[PDB]
Nucleic acid binder design. Structure first.
Ligand SMILES: OC[C@H]1O[C@@H](n2cnc3c(NCc4ccc(O)cc4)ncnc32)[C@H](O)[C@@H]1O
Ligand SMILES: [K+]
Ligand SMILES: [K+]
Length: 545
DNA sequence: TTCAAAAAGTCCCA
DNA sequence: ATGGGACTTTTTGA
């Protein structure tokens, strides 16, 4: 439950908040970490503070009580008035307390360390500087009893599938003094995610965001599947409202390339651009001027969105795939009448323009009337996981029988011509499904509304949607998950805007040529790339880019 | 009644 | 052993 932040990032975060502190004007700064752990940040705060006091000790001695301000008194002063920490783990607090003590009995100095829940603590005062790495706990791994507390007391930032670190953002902001500075490393997903919409609104309207360091899919925490960003914000009265954005360019770099993180930020490994905080909508579109011009051209030119013209839906959720999904060559499928069997595909089966032939079959068990008529299917296939099936939420409440699919959706939505795409991918992969394929929630589908069929065809749509233009266009606002992975979920895919002009016929014809080649047995892959290049030129011409 | 979001992902191998 | 790559379930709030 304890995570170690890399030292190069700890040093950067502490420097970001304290490098320009006027210790002569205010020799009593309050620096807080509300998930301090063993003290990765606080122990570094001590070192920075000690040099700060020692470098100006005679100036403080002259300006203030000359007996109080001596070098031998710096250690006691820092612990009494400057360093504050909180963590739920008692053992970590005890270790940090020893570490701070060992920086030097005489007078039994008191240390401001609290073993508590930082989201419930009654904070008796606000703080000049707040740093640290909060806990990240999503909606599956958080206790329901605790989530009831969060939904009640942190509703301004925490609803639905929000994360625990949203609340730490709110708590840090609320107890930051006027003119104070906060700097934290959290997951990056709130920058684009639907869940973070309220959190983004809370940050934008309560603090000035100085800087966002976006590591994208780079691996900052070794052996941890998370993508990181560093946010620095303040409560200073400033007319200027511009954010420094540092966005990494190569996700494969090692974080220890230089001795300092700021060396990496200034280098060619990162790009820098500024964003006007006043121009942030509910979405934070953090791109350079070239991409903003590119994005705005497409938005203005396109009069339709996919949501306008299409019906979206998520795939089947069985609740226990091993009980219902079988290999098409499994001998146990001889027990299942073919009326119960559906073709089943995974996200990896989706390519551009077409789906691979399915290798798995879904038992649509919802169509099994009762347990007596098809006892063989229940006893020998589905019942092998009856205990796990009975633990599903809708089975415990009696809504579903133990052998039914948890979310079987509507069969008629899948058994039709439609477009399918993987839920997480490195690139746009929109395919026309001709084979009534079913899938789990790792594949999303949509079909065109009847009233828009004479304006848009499936062949045209997969043409533009798979183009290099729309690959770049979608990724401008897409949710970056891990290295070379973006979420392709309807909450953003359905916002993709599309156009219709004089190039419609040739774009559609090129797409049909690609599909015809891809479906050939002696498939000529090379010519497909040439046709794609020609289609990209038409699309770039159509959108004036 | 029933939708869709959510990576401190998960798992394997060189 | 670790770091990097291939691939992606079902729990959950609304
Ligand atoms: O690296 C993360 C670090 O933060 C610490 N930490 C995790 N959760 C909390 C916390 N409130 C949230 C909460 C949630 C559920 C609870 O049953 C109880 C409390 N309040 C303070 N510190 C917390 C950890 O111990 C790690 O040292
Ligand atoms: K004096
Ligand atoms: K990562």
């Amino acid at each position: 439950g304890i995570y170690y932040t890399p030292k190069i990032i700890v040093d950067y975060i502490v420097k970001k908040t304290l490098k320009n502190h006027d210790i002569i004007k205010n020799p009593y700064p309050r620096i807080l970490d509300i998930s301090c752990g063993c003290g990765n940040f606080l122990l570094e705060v001590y070192d920075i503070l000690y040099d700060l006091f020692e470098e100006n000790i005679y100036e403080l001695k002259k300006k203030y009580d000359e007996n109080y301000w001596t070098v031998d008194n710096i250690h006691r002063h820092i612990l009494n008035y400057c360093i504050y920490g909180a963590d739920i783990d008692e053992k970590a607090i005890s270790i940090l307390k020893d570490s701070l003590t060992n920086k030097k009995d005489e007078s039994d100095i008191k240390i401001n360390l609290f073993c508590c829940d930082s989201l419930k603590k009654k904070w008796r005062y606000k703080f000049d500087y707040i740093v640290g790495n909060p806990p990240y706990i999503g909606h599956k791994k958080l206790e329901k009893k605790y989530k009831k507390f969060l939904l009640e007391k942190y509703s301004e930032v925490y609803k639905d599938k929000a994360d625990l670190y949203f609340c730490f953002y709110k708590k840090i902001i609320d107890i930051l003094k006027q003119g104070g500075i906060g700097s934290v490393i959290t997951p990056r997903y709130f920058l684009e995610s639907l869940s973070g919409k309220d959190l983004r609104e809370y940050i934008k309207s309560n603090v000035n965001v100085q800087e966002i360091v976006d590591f994208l899919g780079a691996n900052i925490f070794k052996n941890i599947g998370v993508s990181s960003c560093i946010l620095t914000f303040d409560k200073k009265k400033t007319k200027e409202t511009y954010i420094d954005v540092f966005k990494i360019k190569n996700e494969d770099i090692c974080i220890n390339k230089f001795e300092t993180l700021e060396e990496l930020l200034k280098s060619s490994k990162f790009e820098h651009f500024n964003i006007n905080q006043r121009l942030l909508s509910d979405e934070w579109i953090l791109v350079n001027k070239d991409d903003e011009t590119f994005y705005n051209k497409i938005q203005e030119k396109c009069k339709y969105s996919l949501e306008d013209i299409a019906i979206s839906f998520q795939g089947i959720i069985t609740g226990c795939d091993k009980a219902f999904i079988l290999s098409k060559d499994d001998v146990k499928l001889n027990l299942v009448d073919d009326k119960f069997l559906k073709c089943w595909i995974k996200s990896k089966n989706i390519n551009k323009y077409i789906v691979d032939k399915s290798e798995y079959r879904l038992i649509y068990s919802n169509d099994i009337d009762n347990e007596n008529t098809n006892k063989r299917i229940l006893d020998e296939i589905i019942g092998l996981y009856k205990t796990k099936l009975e633990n599903r939420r809708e089975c415990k409440s009696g809504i579903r029988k133990w052998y039914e699919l948890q979310w079987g959706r509507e069969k008629l939505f899948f058994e039709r011509k439609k477009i399918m795409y993987p839920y997480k991918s490195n690139e746009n992969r929109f395919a026309i499904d001709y084979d009534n394929n079913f899938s789990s929630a790792d594949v999303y589908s949509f079909f065109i509304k009847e009233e828009y069929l004479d304006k848009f065809s499936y062949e045209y749509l997969v043409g533009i949607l798979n183009s290099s233009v729309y690959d770049k266009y979608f990724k401008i606002t897409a949710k970056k998950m891990s290295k070379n992975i973006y979420d392709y979920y309807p909450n953003k895919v359905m916002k993709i805007r599309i156009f219709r002009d004089n190039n419609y016929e040739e774009i559609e014809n090129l797409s049909k040529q690609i599909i015809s080649i891809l479906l050939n047995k002696s498939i000529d892959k090379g010519k497909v790339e040439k046709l794609q290049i020609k289609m990209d030129n038409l699309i770039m011409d159509s959108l004036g880019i």
